Design a protein around this ligand. Structure first.
Ligand code: 0S2
Length: 557
């Protein structure tokens, strides 16, 4: 029951790869310690292969089957529909990897005859053959980090034609099923502010709360054939068209359970028998399987009143404390059960009695104060990776602008406001690119966003308090400060001056640009304006932004 087997052929790049942080004339304005930033490359793929390759054992007990039955009962209330070819085509990102069969993402999006004809042939083949494993490509991801180096993560994905078919069969299911099965525990239904609200309300709902995060070691590799078939059994509980049932069975047998791995050069690299990281069902399947295992483990451990919050392989549990000693023992039992279910821990979980000390989805709840002095809870994170990626993006145009996604998701934070907003608006001004739409990712889905729309987006997501937060926590201030020292980022006085300059220039432009100046940089001036609701904010169609997770699922909006 190996997660992978390997032929010895290398995982190869499909283009030139850089590992060292590229530098231009703008780099120093953000950070001086350039050697601390690196990107992963295929050169480290072998190290990753070694980490992700291991035998899985699974012992499934009555708690597991009990929880599964309950999940299936909820799933049976879901009705899901097939997407049309056109609907599925329109969800394809403009720069998604081209097919090996003579067409690309633009052809798909334009409903070209060649592309649509091929998609039809793939769909027909799915209905007629439920056995033959479908080819996948394995690649080493190029991702940017700060030292202390990680080996490249791997991505495994089927051809463009297949991806469109996955959407047709499964887009409605993976968008709808998780919240029905998991209710308030499904993390992707929340904006950051809503996630904070759920965490705080859950913490407050306990008489004596205790909470912990649980990090499964290499989660995708721990997912077994059993788990993937159990996932299919949950999808099949839905009210589906018979054609959809067949396509779902077929994709499960031929793609989700496993298949051959082919490198960028067309050589056979080996064989996968665990979760593929680059299929439509990666996020939903991981979320369901993590929730199933954790819920059963809570019962095995006799944790009291467990409330889960699950986002793919990311897990937070908040429960009723039974005492420090009892809590620590129950957590060990929980871990032993997760391990039996094939979800052993990377780092051992630890009980926390302060909500702000639990880190999940790389984030934590913190507190600051609004203009009226009231306490506001908001979502933050360690800014190291955001700033490292920001430095790379300062010198190179990249397919996904992490800086933009980070401003959107972390708008209320000390670091996103002081540094990211100031730095990138300065750059946009200089190049007169304020109006140019840019791609970013939210919960794995790709969105094209104009930076001039940021104040409205931020108001809709976080409320007006996002523009007035101050008196951040000492813990949060200290964490930011340490990061700035580590990377060699300029001090607050510098950022405040740059912000006043950016603000002034934005104001003189009028229109949305002036709105950006007024709202984003009100923190930087001596005499603060009293900010009021932006009229055009309600016009944004944000329905669909925080419904589901789509990491690896090739989704665009
Ligand atoms: C106390 C005051 C000087 N002040 C401030 C500075 C901090 C720091 C710092 C570092 C040491 C990390 C540089 S923390 C903090 C606060 O209000 O808690 C602010 O007006 C902040 C400035 C930045 C904007 C975006 C939000 C308001």
């Amino acid at each position: 029951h190996h997660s992978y087997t390997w032929t010895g052929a290398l995982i190869t790049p499909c283009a030139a790869e850089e590992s060292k942080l590229p530098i231009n004339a703008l780099s120093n304005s953000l950070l001086r310690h350039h050697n601390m930033v690196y990107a992963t490359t295929s050169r480290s793929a072998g190290l990753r292969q070694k980490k992700v390759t291991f035998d899985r054992l699974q012992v499934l007990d009555d708690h597991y089957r009990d929880v599964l039955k309950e999940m299936k009962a909820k799933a049976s209330t879901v009705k899901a529909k097939l997407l049309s070819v056109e609907e599925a085509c329109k969800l394809t990102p403009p720069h998604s990897a081209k097919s090996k069969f003579g067409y690309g993402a633009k052809d798909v999006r334009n409903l070209s005859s060649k592309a649509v004809n091929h998609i039809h042939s793939v769909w027909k083949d799915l209905l007629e053959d439920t056995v033959t494993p479908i080819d996948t490509t394995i690649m080493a991801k190029n991702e940017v980090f700060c030292v202390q180096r990680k080996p490249a993560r791997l991505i495994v994905f089927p051809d463009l034609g297949v991806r469109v078919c996955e959407k047709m069969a499964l887009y409605d299911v993976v968008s709808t099923l998780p919240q029905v099965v998991m209710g308030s525990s499904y993390g992707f239904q929340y904006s950051p502010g809503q996630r904070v609200e759920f965490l705080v309300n859950t913490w407050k709902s306990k008489k004596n709360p205790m909470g912990f995060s649980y990090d499964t070691r290499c989660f995708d590799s721990t997912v077994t054939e059993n788990d993937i078939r159990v996932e299919e059994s949950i999808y099949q509980c839905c009210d589906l068209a018979p054609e959809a049932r067949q396509a779902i069975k077929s994709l499960t047998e031929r793609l989700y359970i496993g298949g051959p791995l082919t490198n960028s050069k067309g050589q056979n690299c080996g064989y996968r028998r665990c979760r593929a990281s680059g299929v439509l069902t990666t996020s939903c399947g991981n979320t369901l399987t993590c929730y199933l295992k954790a819920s059963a483990a809570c019962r095995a451990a006799k944790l009291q009143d467990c409330t889960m919050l699950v986002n793919g392989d990311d897990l937070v549990v908040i429960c009723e404390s039974a005492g420090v000693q009892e809590d620590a023992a129950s957590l060990r039992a929980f871990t032993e059960a997760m391990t039996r279910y094939s979800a052993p821990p990377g780092d051992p979980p630890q009980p926390e009695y302060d909500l702000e000390l639990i880190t999940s989805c790389s984030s934590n709840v913190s507190v600051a104060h609004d203009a009226s002095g009231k306490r506001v809870y908001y979502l933050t994170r360690d800014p190291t990776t955001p700033l490292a990626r920001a430095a790379w993006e300062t010198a190179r145009h990249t397919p996904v602008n992490s800086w933009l996604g980070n401003i959107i998701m972390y708008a209320p934070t000390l670091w996103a406001r002081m540094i990211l907003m100031t730095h990138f608006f300065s750059i946009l001004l200089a190049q007169e690119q304020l109006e140019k739409a840019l791609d970013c990712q939210i919960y794995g889905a790709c969105y094209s966003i104009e930076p001039l729309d940021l104040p409205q987006i931020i108001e809709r997501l976080h409320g007006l308090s996002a523009f007035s937060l101050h008196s951040y926590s000492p813990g949060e201030i200290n964490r930011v400060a340490s990061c700035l020292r580590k990377l060699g980022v300029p001090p607050l006085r510098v950022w405040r001056h740059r912000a006043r300059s950016v603000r002034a220039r934005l104001l003189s432009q009028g229109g949305r640009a002036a709105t950006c100046g007024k709202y984003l940089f009100n923190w930087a001036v001596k005499t603060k304006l009293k900010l009021t609701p932006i009229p055009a904010a309600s016009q944004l169609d944000l329905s669909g932004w925080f419904v589901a997770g789509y990491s690896g699922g090739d989704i665009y909006h």
